């Protein structure tokens, strides 16, 4: 049920005798990818043709690519000056996946740099707090990077995050809009990227309240389009009479919406979260996997082009949609849901930089590698290599070990009645949120490593996109479950 | 030759503030002299919260160097409102800015804030600009999202007339005529015809919509956009699949297929998806299973696992 690209017939998308700009770009991309596959040895073969490129994951080249980007960036990176915590996250998460350790001195530098991005009033910005205002996206990127590079010592940065919990929560509340959306920053745009980044951080740091979550589920649900994926945002027509989705289903926004909704399912509020159409989201997800001629990589939108970064955005959303589908069918009353083999083939054959060069991973052939595509190609490769499930028995096991008498101080709500009703409700909420956050498992015997075990990378966690070995100690610290 | 701001008479009173990275920062960017200097003085301006023309000028200098600098964009809009600046002048400046920076979240949001604040009685000029701006990239996501917001926001205020809605559908029809595989324009059609609050729903408007969809499929049988639209349409309006089946059956080998266009290999996977779902509608679970298995075995092997899942769902 997961055929290799090399075992299938490669045919262009048919024209139907009606040319268009879309088809011109598609045909061009089909040629580009198929030509590289033709020059490359089939990763599954014991005997390769002589003269053909070896597709093995060039981990040392990718490490060197990340090293160069890590200690000094050229002047043209100024376009990413407001995204510096992303550059950190893309680097440190990739190194985790590649299995490359940072020394303590380098880790300390990562922590210190990020702490300079934290404002006392609350939240991280894309640069130093004396230069940039807080933003939901750098807040996610900085928090995850601290999970990866930090620790519980006085110089480990986790201590500082714990102290910042109330201020971060207050920043989150300032971002809150009555319809359930959040501005990304003061005066900023409202979309599901904001919701995703906020919910991840609020989950990990134990700063979820009822007043934070009001309408949040409704905003996300109405982002779902007739295609089954999710758009950037929904518009509230004047609590609102109705909500209407604002653009196309996209991999970036579908990833954010599925992950957001999933995080909300562990919150014990009444009639919450408002349901999404899980079957349609799964359908949209699988339909975005490219044909053999385009290497089996994912595209981000119908009739656009395949791109390595969508291995994470679309591919990493698959286990989430699958679990939601599983729950929906259980509410009334196994082969892989996407081609796990083909996606790895796209990664190894098409998404790696040509050997003996700068290293790194990329959008597609003809595109320069960057940190963003390095991280998201690898995060997607991990999802394809390792069969991820959300396990009810693991969640149950987590519930049994949870210590509700241990925790950091409760957040003080903005509105007097914005918190949980009482301590029983609040502690039950903490238990459910923590227990489910640690519910993702790799299924033993589910592993598929295309090209041999030297291609194996570490296991990322769906929804959060950090390694489980980072997630567990991090969330245990803030919930005092260590 | 660059003249430093420390040598400019207009900035003599200002003491620049350095970037506070701390000791030995990771991912440092080697800034140009121009960008470092501008940011050194912006830090000083923002710190003292100066709202002035020189501060406004400085924000422009910076966003030109980094169109993604959300902090500086936020400060710029704050200056515009504080100084009661000409918002129409700013919108004109953004016309050039937006074309060169299609994927900038903050440029597009800046436009939104300007339109929201200007709040024109008739937004026709902006609608026209937006249509024009789509020439270099007909699929620019932020533009389509912005177009959705514009019509939704201004319709809420009761400022979109029936003539305006009508010409918008005409433009959308033209977009899909030029490229029927433009999924962004298909999405816009759904807003115009189905999702917007003021959209007409009658048995006759459904008829017209079916005709358009079917005609689109016959013109481009392998167009996933048209197929997805059809499936969304029937699902949204709770319409049975069976009565339309005659128009779709030929692809499994009201407007009907051509008496077939060249370069149309059969079967079309999504036509088989339609047929299997039509069997499901008829309680014929074994007939659906066989179609799903064929999609899994032969006709859409990339999705072998998903179609197998769908087959097991019948059994």
């Amino acid at each position: 049920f997961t055929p290799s690209v090399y075992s299938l017939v490669s045919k262009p998308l048919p024209s139907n005798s009606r040319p268009s700009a879309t088809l011109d770009e598609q045909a061009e991309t089909e040629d580009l990818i198929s030509q590289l596959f033709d020059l490359t040895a089939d990763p599954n073969a014991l005997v390769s043709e002589h003269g053909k490129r070896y597709s093995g994951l060039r981990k040392q080249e990718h490490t060197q690519f990340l090293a160069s980007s890590f200690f000094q960036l050229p002047g043209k990176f100024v376009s990413l000056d407001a995204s510096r915590p992303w550059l950190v996250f893309w680097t440190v998460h990739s190194l985790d996946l590649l299995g490359v350790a940072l020394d303590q001195g380098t880790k300390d530098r990562v922590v210190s740099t990020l702490l300079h991005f934290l404002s006392p009033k609350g939240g991280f910005g894309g640069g130093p707090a004396n230069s940039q205002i807080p933003h939901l996206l750098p807040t996610y990127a900085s928090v995850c990077s601290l999970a990866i590079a930090g620790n519980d010592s006085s110089t480990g940065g986790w201590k500082d995050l714990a102290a910042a919990r109330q201020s971060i929560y207050e920043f989150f509340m300032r971002c809150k809009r009555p319809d359930g959306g959040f501005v990304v920053c003061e005066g900023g745009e409202v979309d599901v990227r904001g919701t995703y980044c906020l919910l991840v951080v609020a989950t990990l740091l134990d700063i979820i309240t009822p007043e934070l979550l009001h309408n949040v589920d409704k905003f996300v649900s109405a982002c779902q389009t007739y295609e089954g994926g999710f758009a950037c945002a929904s518009f509230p027509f004047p609590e609102p009479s109705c909500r209407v989705s604002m653009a196309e289903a996209h991999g970036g926004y579908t990833s954010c919406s599925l992950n957001s909704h999933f995080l909300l399912t562990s919150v014990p509020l009444p009639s919450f979260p408002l349901s999404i159409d899980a079957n349609a989201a799964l359908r949209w997800t699988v339909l975005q996997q490219g044909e053999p001629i385009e290497g089996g990589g994912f595209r981000g939108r119908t009739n656009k082009l395949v791109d390595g970064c969508y291995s994470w955005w679309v591919g990493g959303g698959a286990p989430v949609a699958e679990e939601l589908v599983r729950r929906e069918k259980s509410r009334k009353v196994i082969p892989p849901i996407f081609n796990r083999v083909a996606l790895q083939e796209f990664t190894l054959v098409a998404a790696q930089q040509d050997p003996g060069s700068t290293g790194g991973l990329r959008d597609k052939p003809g595109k320069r590698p960057d940190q963003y595509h390095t991280c998201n190609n690898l995060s997607g490769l991990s999802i394809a290599q390792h069969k991820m499930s959300h396990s009810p028995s693991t969640v149950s096991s987590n519930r049994l070990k949870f210590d509700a008498s241990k925790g950091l101080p409760a957040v003080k709500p903005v509105a007097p009645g914005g918190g949980w009703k009482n301590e029983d409700e609040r502690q039950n909420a903490r238990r459910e949120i923590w227990a489910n956050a640690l519910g993702w498992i790799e299924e033993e015997g589910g592993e598929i490593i295309v090209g041999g075990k030297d291609n194996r990378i570490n296991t990322t966690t769906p929804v959060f996109n950090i390694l489980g070995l980072r997630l567990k100690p991090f969330i245990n610290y803030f919930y005092c479950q260590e | 030759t660059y003249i430093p701001m420390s040598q400019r008479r207009s900035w003599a009173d200002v003491k620049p503030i350095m970037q506070d990275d701390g000791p030995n920062p990771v991912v440092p960017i080697m800034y140009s002299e121009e960008y470092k200097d501008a940011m050194d003085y912006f830090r000083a301006i923002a710190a003292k919260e100066e709202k002035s023309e020189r501060a406004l000028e400085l924000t422009e200098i910076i966003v030109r160097m980094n169109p993604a600098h959300y902090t500086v964009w936020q400060y710029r809009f704050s200056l515009l409102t504080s100084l009661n600046k000409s918002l129409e002048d700013e919108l004109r400046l953004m016309n050039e800015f937006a074309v060169q920076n299609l994927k900038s979240y903050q440029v597009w949001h800046h436009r939104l804030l300007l339109l929201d604040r200007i709040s024109p009685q008739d937004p026709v000029s902006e609608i026209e600009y937006i249509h024009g701006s789509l020439l270099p990239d007909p699929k620019n996501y932020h533009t389509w999202a912005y177009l959705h917001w514009l019509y939704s926001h201004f319709s809420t205020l009761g400022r979109i007339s029936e003539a305006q809605w009508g010409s918008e559908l005409d433009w959308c029809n033209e977009m899909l005529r030029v490229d029927g595989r433009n999924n962004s324009a298909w999405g816009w059609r759904w807003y115009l015809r189905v999702s917007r609050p003021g959209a007409e729903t009658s048995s006759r408007s459904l008829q017209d919509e079916l005709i358009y969809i079917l005609k689109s499929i016959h013109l481009i049988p392998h167009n996933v956009s048209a197929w997805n639209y059809l499936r969304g349409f029937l699902k949204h309006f709770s319409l049975p699949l069976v009565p339309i089946l005659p128009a779709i059956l030929p692809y499994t080998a009201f407007p009907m297929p051509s008496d077939l266009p060249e370069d149309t290999p059969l079967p079309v996977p999504l036509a088989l998806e339609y047929l299997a779902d039509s069997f499901i509608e008829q309680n014929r679970v074994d007939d659906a299973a066989k179609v799903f298995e064929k999609l899994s075995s032969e006709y859409d092997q990339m999705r072998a696992g998903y179609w197998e899942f769908r087959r097991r769902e019948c059994a």
Binding site: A82, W86, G126, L137, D307 | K103, Y105
Partner: peptide, 6 residues
């Protein structure tokens, strides 16, 4: 034609 997430 780079990718932009922020």
């Amino acid at each position: 034609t780079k990718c932009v997430v922020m």
